[PDB]
Design a protein around this ligand. Sequence first.
Ligand SMILES: Nc1ncnc2c1ncn2[C@@H]1O[C@H](CSCC[C@H](N)C(=O)O)[C@@H](O)[C@H]1O
Ligand SMILES: [Zn+2]
Ligand SMILES: [Zn+2]
Ligand SMILES: [Zn+2]
Lengths: 81, 431, 104, 91, 55, 52
Amino acid sequence: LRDNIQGITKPAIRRLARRGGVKRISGLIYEETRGVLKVFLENVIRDAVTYTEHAKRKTVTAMDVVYALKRQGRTLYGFGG
Amino acid sequence: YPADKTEEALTTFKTLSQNSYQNKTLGNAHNGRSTADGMSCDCEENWDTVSGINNACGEYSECINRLTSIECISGTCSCGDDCQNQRFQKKQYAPIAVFETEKKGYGVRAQADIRQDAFIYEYLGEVIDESTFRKRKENYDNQGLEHFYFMMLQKGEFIDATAKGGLGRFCNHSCRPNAYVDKWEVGNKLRMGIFAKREIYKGEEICFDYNVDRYGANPQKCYCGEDNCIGFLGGRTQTDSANILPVPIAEALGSTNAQEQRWVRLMKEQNKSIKASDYSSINEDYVNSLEMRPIADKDEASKVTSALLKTQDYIILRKLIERVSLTKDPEVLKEIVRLRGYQCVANILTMIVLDQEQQQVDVESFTLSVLDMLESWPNSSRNRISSSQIESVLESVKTKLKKIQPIGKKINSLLNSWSKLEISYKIPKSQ
Amino acid sequence: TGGVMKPHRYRPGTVALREIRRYQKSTELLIRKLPFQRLVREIAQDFKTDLRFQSAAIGALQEASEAYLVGLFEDTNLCAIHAKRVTIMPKDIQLARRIRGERA
Amino acid sequence: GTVALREIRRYQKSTELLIRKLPFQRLVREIAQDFKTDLRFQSAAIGALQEASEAYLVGLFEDTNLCAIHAKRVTIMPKDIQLARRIRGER
Amino acid sequence: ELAGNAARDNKKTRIIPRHLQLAIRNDEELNKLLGRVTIAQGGVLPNIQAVLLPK
Amino acid sequence: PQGEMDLLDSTRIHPEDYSLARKMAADALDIEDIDDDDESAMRNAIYEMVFP
Ligand SMILES: Nc1ncnc2c1ncn2[C@@H]1O[C@H](CSCC[C@H](N)C(=O)O)[C@@H](O)[C@H]1O
Ligand SMILES: [Zn+2]
Ligand SMILES: [Zn+2]
Ligand SMILES: [Zn+2]
């Protein structure tokens, strides 16, 4: 898998901004949103990965993800928490 | 004022109170995707107890649906029944009358003063598919009808106002219109309304921009009388490379569709910049690179005279004057005299050698390039010159550029030649 | 004379406000599943490979990322409104992250 | 303008508390009275409250200065206060 | 209770995460208690700013 | 005004005097760019005199 950060396409991030009540979108903002999404995903994925590695498992389950998110003060309801 | 023709106009077609559909599938909003969760405005019903009128969703209210061009539906919205955003459904048209003036046919006039952004009248007609539109268009072209009666409701769906419709079909095109057509959503359907772009007073004609796609049809001359008129009815070009300068002006320079194609094809396709279609800015390089051939047609001479009366560019006038220098047909020159070419040449001189947007050497070259055909044209009376008094301009410019002695001597020879010509009579008037 | 009059285009903001209402009324996922899954796998590859990712974990990650982005865009819209603008810029994103404490 | 930078440099280099002790003490007692009467207070609890409130107000003023900077201004306004509080999550 | 009421305004007999998110976010004290939680498939409350609208 | 029909066809003026009538109409409207040989301007002038 090689540089699929472009998979978060411009209409999709436009939709995500549009849900927040934003009327106009600058042309330079898309790289910034991709960067912050990469940072957030990086942190949560890192925490989930070390949770899985402590559990002596090779597959990340939903429980590790919900645990990592709740440990960052971003508690998620609906996935067996 | 002009006599009312409202009933006479009404008798020409089957009056409709609402849009008719070829079938139940056409004209549905969201391409037929029924939005069961219809967009309900959160407005509270504001009933004036005196008049019994529900003032909710008014013009100066904050109704979200009104802003988003969606009409409230009774029994589904919190605004209640008979709100102020049911203009299409209640059919509350502005009061209008039909009359006739200038070269136009029937036309619509305002029977009362109409506010800005106010709904005027719903464009009515039969909703038809593309094939039915093509068949009706072919039938009308066979019938020789000289009037547009088709509007695009949306992609693949048109509205015909020929045999059945409303008063809106009599609205005439204006290149500086006071009204405009807009698309709105009423329930699960799409409507086309006409709204006031500005404040319109009683008796004034109501007009909108047609922005007409010709679909390959020939141009029709525009007689709206607006100062900003382009002279023909149309819209956006069907492709790039189609025009660089306005037709009359382009054909005045000897350029045609092929010569306007060739320049853009040679540079734009080879990584050199040509701007979009806009005649407000003249591209001097195209005019310099254009080829020039002598004029032998009087309609081309009329187009040249129109270009002189319209174009302000130095380079276009230079190349037109050069083309006239190549031109030596006496009949075209007599036509230019009838068109009063001297009158236009006076302004062409004045703008360049009295107003100074250029360099003195280049203006001198221009003056030497424009005195020659003035010396060469056939002249038989000072009454030709009297329609322009271009001699006065010649005196002013020889006095301003007195240091450039060839121009002065040529103007001396020119005024000496013109001074000897005969004169023609003007009937004396009582005093 | 068989030409057609065009319906012209909408004003800037009308279709924007329409789609604002449409996306704030509906609840489906706005990020495509497969590119987001590939992105998650790309981020996870950098630490230790041969890591299988259950569908529920990917869905939870997608939901959390969408919630975070929506909240950040709400804050950035507030920032843009404060600066007498209606268009959000990256400087508002950076300022929102700064005041939120996510960026030092 | 010069004395503004002098005050900024002096207070950013100093470490003593800037809120006066006795009015803050009376404010704490007045606030605590309406939850329960006849309340006693240790001095160290009042000092801890003063230090925490001063740190919180300094952080709020820094974020408010950032908000004021955003709007091409140099003067802080109440709208900056509620913008910082709204974004930070207080109600 | 609040979720069933919010469903009742939506003319629905099925409680979904959307109604739960509506019930939580529209009540001040419940929003205060459940501040830092994201409801899966809950969506966002409709909120358009006043000066964002045209004139 | 340049059309096939003519204003003076509804009068008692003979067709040999149509240019005479148009010169009268043009000179009465104080026009000065008019030339006798320009029939178009004559027709425009008489049209604006009889049907302003
Ligand atoms: N400004 C204008 N100049 C010339 N013709 C115009 C015009 N505006 C409209 N038209 C003509 O009117 C047509 C639209 S239908 C308008 C009503 C019609 N003229 C009638 O009286 O029955 C156009 O296709 C064109 O032929
Ligand atoms: Zn309403
Ligand atoms: Zn309403
Ligand atoms: Zn026109």
